Symmetry: D2
Subunit: 387 residues, 4 copies
């Protein structure tokens, strides 16, 4: 009881994750810059299935079109040498000072045109490399002060940018979908579409909604004090869980990005319970930063523990759902009754049913216990291996 990943677990990492050199808003870098080749080799050794990338993780901002190709060719060699895939790719529209007021909602209209052209060039690459999902994190879309952004106009510009992306993909015939990744704040004071629910809502107003879903990340819902497995339940109920970012976060503070398992560990248990019982079948992607305390040995430790923690919690969630005593408890708590329709008899029948009101014994019903605490300690004893 040992927990060894293989490439079939679908574990992926961004280049920026094991590649983060530990430069924070108060500190210089503490690690040198990894070659993308490197990282591909090391990650394949650890059992990973693939990697993801921003355009500028792969090709240095500014690159000519003969360096560009060079970068790509090296990359491609390493994937072919290791068997690693590239399921997902994304654009950096945050680093470069030109992005300081956003990329698709920046007040300057020339910036907003340049954000779309940067994006479209990388969609073509991603498609080349075989990615299925193209993520958009608008981390610079938002404001520090209430008169600097009209939000209605800015959502109009964001819808315009996603609609022209949708056009371009369907005009090229590409098989690629888009996944918006919410974040509530940081590095802007407030970030537009700050949660999964605001990103799901916004999708429903694009021209082609079936092209877009979400990429929620553990630590960014938690940065609003929200229940991340409830978030993901709703995204699954909408049909829009295209991709996920897995990692940890200790409560409402700056975005920590700790390895997956760290943070809220019970939330991580019920998230694995839910992905595996809903049958999510996209990549289990880790968007994490190895703390800057760490050297490169710490880096590969940290990326391994991500995968380990995922497999342990999988095993404990599967044994919980398999346990007859737990399935008895779930009946005692009437989760079987939550899955049945309230009134499949229809409205008229409901309205003529005296047992539904006139002759409903409210006291007898209020007196029933829900038996949730016994059910939740069962879940505790399963996660701790006490069962």
């Amino acid at each position: 009881m040992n927990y060894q990943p293989t490439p079939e677990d679908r574990f992926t990492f961004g280049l920026w994750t094991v590649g983060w050199q530990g430069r924070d808003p108060f500190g210089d870098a503490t690690r040198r810059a990894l070659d993308p080749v490197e990282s591909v080799q090391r990650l394949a050794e650890l059992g990973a299935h693939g990697v993801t990338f921003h355009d500028d993780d792969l090709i240095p901002f500014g690159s000519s079109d003969s360096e560009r190709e060079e970068h790509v060719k090296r990359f491609r060699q390493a994937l072919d040498d290791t068997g690693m895939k590239v399921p997902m790719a994304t654009t950096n529209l945050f680093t470069h000072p030109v992005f300081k007021d956003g990329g698709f909602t920046a007040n300057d209209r020339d910036v907003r045109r340049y954000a779309l052209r940067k994006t479209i060039r990388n969609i073509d690459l991603a498609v080349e490399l075989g990615a299925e999902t193209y993520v958009a994190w608008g981390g610079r879309e938002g404001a520090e002060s209430g008169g600097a952004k009209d939000v209605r106009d800015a959502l109009d510009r964001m819808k315009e940018a996603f609609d022209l992306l949708g056009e371009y993909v369907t005009s090229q015939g590409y098989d690629i979908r888009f996944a918006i990744e919410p974040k509530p704040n940081e590095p802007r004071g407030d970030i537009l579409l700050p949660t999964v629910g605001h990103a799901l809502a916004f999708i429903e107003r694009l021209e082609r909604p079936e092209l877009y879903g979400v990429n929620p990340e553990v630590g960014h819902e938690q940065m609003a004090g929200l229940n991340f497995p409830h978030g993901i339940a709703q995204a699954l109920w909408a049909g829009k869980l295209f991709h996920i970012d897995l990692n940890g976060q200790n409560g409402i503070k700056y975005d920590q990005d700790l390895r997956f398992g760290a943070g809220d560990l019970r939330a991580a248990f019920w998230l694995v319970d839910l992905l595996e019982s809903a049958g999510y079948s996209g990549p289990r992607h880790f968007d994490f930063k190895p703390p800057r305390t760490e050297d490169f040995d710490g880096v590969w430790a940290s990326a391994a523990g991500c995968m380990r923690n995922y497999l342990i919690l999988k095993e404990r969630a599967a044994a919980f759902r398999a346990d007859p005593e737990v399935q008895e408890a779930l009946r005692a708590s009437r989760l079987d009754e939550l899955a049945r329709p309230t009134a499949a008899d229809g409205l008229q029948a409901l309205l003529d049913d005296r047992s539904a009101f006139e002759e409903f014994d409210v006291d007898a019903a209020a007196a029933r216990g829900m038996a949730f605490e016994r059910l939740d300690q069962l879940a505790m004893d399963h996660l701790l291996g006490a069962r």
Copy 2:
């Protein structure tokens, strides 16, 4: 410079607001129970336009159908004597112990049938009394522990309950819409559809979405650390701001419900700026609790300051938008450019525009300042009357 409401400002209060007897989770009541008649009289004197009610604020839980009528008739007299309206009404599906695991998503299916029948009886009343909007706050829909609620099944039950309400209203021919009011937590650990964005998303999956919008409340988005005027911008951009609850809240903690102005005062300025410049024309409804320190004189003080603060902030937001120097600033900050389409030239033109990429000077563009701090102190000097 004086700020006197009239019934044309559309100011409304819930019965439960000035009626709250100050019973908290650690303390007994500190004020006796007001007659609904009372409150109607006192509120009309203060300049209010109307009141709102839960079924059980008006008619005591349990009431026969000859007390029921009695209650209603008294009520009706007071409205006719004062000219007060009833724009909005709502159901109590939280107080009574039968609701302890929810009303439309309670695990027991009999409870869920009884929640719908209670609801439908009050829709008929509301319609009688002339309300235009029927609010649903599911404050007991949610969980304290992750195995006690399957969220996918529970959203299925919530959609079923709202769809049968929609059926019933359109079968009766009623002119009534529904407004879901999010809250992230309290009194459940976590509450389903915790934010405006999750409530907007959920709406898009009902059978008749055009019947449903939102009733956001200041202090409940703030309980997630979210920017309430950005929330309301998005609800306005979706066409779904049916009703609002106005009040204050100091940050991420239990739901304070302070009078409107208290709390985040700058957030209250940019919320009034936005309602009045978007032309919101529903009720300005105050969902607040006069602190339990207060006697009944404190109560009517507190409900007056709600209205005052709203009028002061209206005047300061109007003088800010009217000020030529502020309109110069907003051009300096390129809010005029945020309102223009990014690419009304279309995708092909964008892609053949060299000035959009190949010949876009990114340094010159990154060098421009956005001039937001000068713009935001203008907004500060306007709100403080320093202008």
Copy 3:
């Protein structure tokens, strides 16, 4: 692997905990009122060591002095019949409407005199029943608005109240100490001495500081987003961990009071690691509320899981500290070096040590990894039983 408490584990519960009838700020009670006798019997059966009480949990507010005695005598019988102890007692200065603006810092001076007399009468009882610690939670000391409380004057009144308590105990010859329990907010907007650190600071200004320590509670530091085991480390470093309240809390929201283990489970692991390795030897007291979903079977389940979770986490923290690989890791991470003095050579030696500055190789030192991620996955594999 089974985890059975005994009275030697020092497990205690307040009467108010298993006794909470589930009345919340939106809902009526869902359970009838337990006799204190009852609770003493049931808790002894579960393995508990004792109970604690507010004056008004035991004797009904208002009680004559012949009911008073009656109450006490019954109580006393049950303790003698079960062997249960009463290590800690406390005053209700929150419920009764007279307390609405506080008890020792209420603006009315007559209230403040009545708070002290209520307190002193219960210190005499507590002493009768054998308690060693007298807790003070000033849950109504604080304000909703900034002009309603001058905080300097209020800390003067709080110091005056604690100094006269100290006088009274040392004039009576009682062996009793006091423990202040911080809470940051709820039911007041803001509560004075909101954290362990503000309560430790305040102690240092009383006349007899050696009489006072703290009673921190898991969920109340977490309500400020603070690291509860770091809090308790500091209280232990000051010599002031007199008593503790154990329970759970999911982040920054209203005070949930979930059973102990729920909430932040990793925080609960490092808190047990720290109490047991520092050798805390007071009561392990559970200040929790069985959710109002629950019937009385749910109640006793919930109070059992408190104790279970504590024993499981004890075992996992002991196996982590006992593991040779973990003790190697802790050397790799230089926790051995953190325990050594920086400069026991003294200031002059430090200043003449060239290896400390002039000839300190800062790059070589920055290059060392701290090896914390490998150390923290070891801790994860120990808590999950994966080791």
Copy 4:
């Protein structure tokens, strides 16, 4: 009604504030690097009284001792040319990768020796330049994971470091005090002494406590959801408000550092009310970052609005306290009674006073209203200039 600072308002800025080049954890710098000379000139023109500095803001890390002197001499010239003072100085023990696990509590003992020697060299400079206060922000003292730092050992190392600093200052005969600046988190997961209350407590355990106070910052208490004017009240009640950092923050999130007034504006009103009515007479120091949207014109706008907002709020707090109606209200609310001793009659008299218990009419007393809402709208109408 105009609000013009002069050098007598005691307004100071850190070099790092107007000097921040806008490099964030997702973005490059958006402004070039200001010469310290520059900033001194520009700030004197705006009305400032002085500046503050980290060692490494002034002299580039690594500097020889002939560049060192050069740096200092230029600096000195600009102060002499403008009349600017240097009231406060501080050490950078956060940037350099050697600091990645802290400076005075870093696990490596050699680091901790090098942190103290860096510190002591800058105390000598500060003393040269005339500073009265030496701040310590331990922004890298803390941990991301619970086994990486034993907090008891780390507080022992922090006390050792502050005690040897105290020794060195009193051995040199310097007139300099120390001010610890709390922060709850960022850039570490958790930061030791996270609040004012934990920093006040810790002080009481140093060898010479009278040498140390606090430097609270608005936005860092707010990052715990705490009431910053209550914090500062307690620091004033302890005699330990040595210095302050003024700025804004919108709630519990990453450290924004917005100009002073932005953020919680009502909290800023009651903080100015309190500093000016307590007669705080240290520097009003602004620790803020001009957002990275801004060019250098935005920079000097932002630093001006800091000072403006402070003067406006001063005027509004003075007119509130001067208003007879407000002084009537404060009597109605019994703030006069909060300032009187509870029992200056002594314990025995309290205990023999029947009017204090046996014959205390609790109902009559609970029935009194506190009249706080009328008092708080008066405060609202004063801050908005509506009065």
